Amino acid sequence: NSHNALKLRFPAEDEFPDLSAHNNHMAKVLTPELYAELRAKSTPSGFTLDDVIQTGVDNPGHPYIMTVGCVAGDEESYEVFKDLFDPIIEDRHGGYKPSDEHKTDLNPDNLQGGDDLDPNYVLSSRVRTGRSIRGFCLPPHCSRGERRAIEKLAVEALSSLDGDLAGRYYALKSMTEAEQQQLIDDHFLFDKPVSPLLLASGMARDWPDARGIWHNDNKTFLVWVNEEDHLRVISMQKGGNMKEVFTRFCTGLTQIETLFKSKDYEFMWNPHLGYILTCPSNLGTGLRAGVHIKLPNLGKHEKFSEVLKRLRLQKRGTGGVDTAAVGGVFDVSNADRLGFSEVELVQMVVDGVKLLIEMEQRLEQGQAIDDLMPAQK
Ligand SMILES: *CC(=O)N1C[C@@H](C(N)=O)Oc2ccccc21
């Protein structure tokens, strides 16, 4: 690329971004020396360090909520600029060292229990993840031709799914106002990105070309094509049979991967980073296994955050599916993504939810939970 060479004509410090008041991990890792060493490297697709750190430069963040500050344009991005990604991965994934190994377990039989979470508290159970198809650039860097290719192969694979997974595909471009309305009412629809995060990163290029929503006829399995990763996979079920949701998650992923392999394509995966995705923060399992749960008394407790932290879980939001119950209903999911297998995260969620329910009941009786406080897991 001639532009990166023209940049190289400038002193490195003269091209170094001003990350003074930034609070992302990239700003915490990017020394002026690292920029000098890597500001010349590039990936086969043409992804540069500036293309990796632009979002972090434009989007400072909050000290409380530390964003990663960088994205990947392709698989090779994680190795070409590993001298930058690895420290941020260590900092954002609990000290995951460069030599650590990620184990991926997708055998639902290895999860203990989780079939009967108290239906009077757990309203919904959902497991979400992402996948990148090897050989294509990621959404921040992919091309119209690429994107259209991935959409074609993904739609073929989904159209091959049958049974409880048999479903339909809606292309965002061809959607009628009626179909769009139905999807919005279903909470299945993703709209055109508007955040200064995504728009600056180029994740919204050529919208809505090659972007789609596939869902099974039972509204329990949903796939998003070319939105924020090549595929975004969600398995959801009203209630608390987390085992069923995770089993659907696993089997659907396995069938999709089998179809892709039959067509000589595969997911981006390695034994150190797990599955490869645009954002470093979703590496390894990209798994967000959560529950919408009625924990009104516990939510107003001054230890709720500490209990969630010790259980290795996070409160990703409040309100539940239909907003409404903000303060009473909470969306609680696994906090870790890399360094733990999928089964381990789902386990952690089930186990923590049981104790949360017990705490909520005890607080209901007017008693104290100081005896039920867990130890850091
Ligand atoms: C990790 C992630 O999803 N990010 C990080 C974010 C930031 N500014 O730190 O920027 C973007 C932009 C586009 C896609 C993903 C991310």
Swiss-Prot record:
Protein residues bound to ATP: 124-128, 187, 232, 288, 316-321, 331
Covalent link (Glycyl lysine isopeptide (Lys-Gly) (interchain with G-Cter in ubiquitin)) residue numbers: 41, 97, 103, 377
Post-translational changes noted in the entry: Ubiquitinated by the ECS(ASB9) complex, leading to its degradation by the proteasome.
Gene Ontology MF annotations: ATP binding; creatine kinase activity; ubiquitin protein ligase binding
Domain notes: The internal MTS-like signal (iMTS-L) mediates targeting to mitochondria thermogenic fat cells.
Listed name of the protein: Creatine kinase B-type
Disulfide bridges in this chain: none
Residues recorded as bearing Phosphothreonine in the entry: 31, 318
Comp. bias (Basic and acidic residues): 92-106
Domain named Phosphagen kinase N-terminal: residues: 7-94
Location of region: Disordered: 92-118
Subunit-structure text: Dimer of identical or non-identical chains, which can be either B (brain type) or M (muscle type). With MM being the major form in skeletal muscle and myocardium, MB existing in myocardium, and BB existing in many tissues, especially brain. Interacts with SLC12A6 (via C-terminus); the interaction may be required for SLC12A6 potassium-chloride cotransport activity.
Keywords: ATP-binding, Cell membrane, Cytoplasm, Isopeptide bond, Kinase, Membrane, Mitochondrion, Nitration, Nucleotide-binding, Phosphoprotein, Transferase, Ubl conjugation
Listed Gene3D superfamilies: ATP:guanido phosphotransferase, N-terminal domain, Glutamine synthetase/guanido kinase, catalytic domain
Region of interest called Internal MTS-like signal, as start-end residue ranges on this chain: 126-134
Record bears the keyword Membrane: yes
InterPro entries recorded: ATP-guanido_PTrfase, ATP-guanido_PTrfase_AS, ATP-guanido_PTrfase_cat, ATP-guanido_PTrfase_N, ATP-guanido_PTrfase_N_sf, Gln_synth/guanido_kin_cat_dom
SUPFAM superfamilies: Glutamine synthetase/guanido kinase (SSF55931), Guanido kinase N-terminal domain (SSF48034)
Function: Reversibly catalyzes the transfer of phosphate between ATP and various phosphogens (e.g. creatine phosphate). Creatine kinase isoenzymes play a central role in energy transduction in tissues with large, fluctuating energy demands, such as skeletal muscle, heart, brain and spermatozoa. Acts as a key regulator of adaptive thermogenesis as part of the futile creatine cycle: localizes to the mitochondria of thermogenic fat cells and acts by mediating phosphorylation of creatine to initiate a futile cycle of creatine phosphorylation and dephosphorylation.
Residues where Phosphoserine is found: 195, 305
Cited CDD domains: creatine_kinase_like
Domain Phosphagen kinase C-terminal: start-end pairs: 121-363
